[PDB]
Write a protein that binds this ligand. Structure first.
Ligand SMILES: COc1cc(Br)ccc1CO
Ligand SMILES: COc1cc(Br)ccc1CO
Ligand SMILES: COc1cc(Br)ccc1CO
Ligand SMILES: COc1cc(Br)ccc1CO
Lengths: 190, 190
C-alpha cells in the first residue's frame, strides 16, 4: 500500500465533500432550514480541517461558507457576526462590482440596525465607529430604529440580495462530482 | 426543484462520506497517526449528525467508529474509555466468537491495567468492581502492575488484536464508492 497515493485519494475525496457541503449549505440558507444549516456548517468546518493546502477555487468555497455562517448568525473576533461577514465579503466575489456594493452597503447598515433592534444602542454606536455619516449617527443617538433609511436598507432587503447571490453559487456548484453522482442514484430508482 | 429528491441525494452522499471516513479512521488507527485520527473522527461524527435513519450496515459502521474512538482514548458516561469500548464491543462483531472473546478479555484486563499504569489504584478497583477474580483483585490491591498476568494480557497485545480486526474492516470497505472513485482519479494522473 502506498501511503502517499492513499493520502492523495483522501485529499481528492475531501475536495469532493467540500463542494457537496457548500451546495448543501447554500440550499439550507436559501430555504431557511436553520437546523440543517447548523449541521451542514459543522460538517463542512470539520472537512475543511482535513485540508492543509487549498486551490484558488477551494479558498473561494470555504470563504463563501464562512460568509454565510456569519450572515446566519447576524442577529445572535471582538466584532459582531455581520461586521465579520463584511470582512469576508470584499476579499471574495469582488469581480461583479454592482451587486457586490449593494450587499456590502446593506451589511454595513444592518450591522448597526440589528444592534438597535436588540436594544443595544451603545453597541450600535461602537459598530458604527468601527465601520465608518453624521445623519446615521443622529439616527442611532435618537434610537430611531424605524427611520425610512432603515426601511430601504432593511434586513429583508439584505437577505434578498444575499439569497440571489447564493442562487448563483448554487447554480455554479449544482454539477459537482458528489452531488451529480448522488442525484443519479436517486433518479435510477425512481 | 424537488426538495424530497434533493434531500434523498444528500442522504446518499452522507452514506458515501460515512464509509469513506470509516476507512480513513481505520488506516489512521492502524498507522498510529493520532492527529489524523482526531480530525477524521471529528469529520465522521459531524457527518453522522446529518443522518437520521441508518441501515443495519450503517449502524455497524458508526459503532466501529465509536469503538475505535474509545480504544484510542484508552489511556486518557461515568465509566472509563476502555469500559465504554467494552460496551460497544459485544453489541458489534459477535458472529466471529473466537477473536471476539480475545479482544473482549484483553479490553477487560486493560481497563484495569491502564488505571494502575496511571497511578490511580482506587479507580482500578472501581473499574474491576464494575466489570467483574480474587487473584485479579489481589494484584490491584498490591499495585503489582508488572505481574506476569498483565504481560500476557498486555496493552500491546490488546492493540495487536484490535489492529488485526481493523484490517478486516479496512479490507471490507476498501472498495466503497467514494474511496474507489478517488483512487481512480489519483491513478489516472500518475
Ligand atoms: C433566512 O435567512 C437565514 C437563514 C438561516 Br438557515 C439562518 C438565519 C437566517 C437569517 O436570520
Ligand atoms: C473554514 O472555517 C470555517 C468554515 C465554516 Br463552514 C464556518 C466557519 C469557519 C470559521 O469560523
Ligand atoms: C496505536 O494505537 C493507537 C492509535 C491511535 Br491513532 C491513538 C492511540 C492509540 C493507542 O494509544
Ligand atoms: C456517532 O457517534 C460518534 C461517532 C464517532 Br466517529 C465518535 C464518537 C461518537 C459518539 O461519542
Amino acid at each position: 500500500e502506498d501511503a502517499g497515493l492513499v493520502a492523495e485519494a483522501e485529499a481528492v475525496a475531501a475536495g469532493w465533500m467540500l463542494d457537496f457541503l457548500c451546495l448543501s449549505l447554500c440550499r439550507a440558507f436559501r430555504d431557511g432550514r436553520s437546523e440543517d444549516f447548523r449541521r451542514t456548517r459543522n460538517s463542512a468546518e470539520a472537512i475543511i480541517h482535513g485540508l492543509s493546502s487549498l486551490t484558488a477555487c477551494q479558498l473561494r468555497t470555504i470563504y463563501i461558507c464562512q460568509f454565510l455562517t456569519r450572515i446566519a448568525a447576524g442577529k445572535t473576533e471582538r466584532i459582531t457576526p455581520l461586521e465579520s461577514a463584511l470582512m469576508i465579503w470584499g476579499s471574495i466575489e469582488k469581480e461583479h462590482d454592482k451587486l457586490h456594493e449593494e450587499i456590502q452597503n446593506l451589511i454595513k447598515i444592518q450591522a448597526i440596525a440589528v444592534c438597535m433592534e436588540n436594544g443595544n444602542f451603545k453597541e450600535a454606536e461602537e459598530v458604527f465607529e468601527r465601520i465608518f455619516k453624521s445623519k446615521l449617527l443622529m439616527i442611532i443617538s435618537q434610537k430611531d430604529t424605524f427611520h425610512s433609511f432603515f426601511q430601504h436598507f432593511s434586513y429583508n432587503h439584505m437577505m434578498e440580495k444575499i439569497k440571489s447571490y447564493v442562487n448563483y453559487v448554487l447554480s455554479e456548484k449544482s454539477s459537482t462530482f458528489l452531488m451529480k453522482a448522488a442525484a443519479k442514484v436517486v433518479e435510477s430508482k425512481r
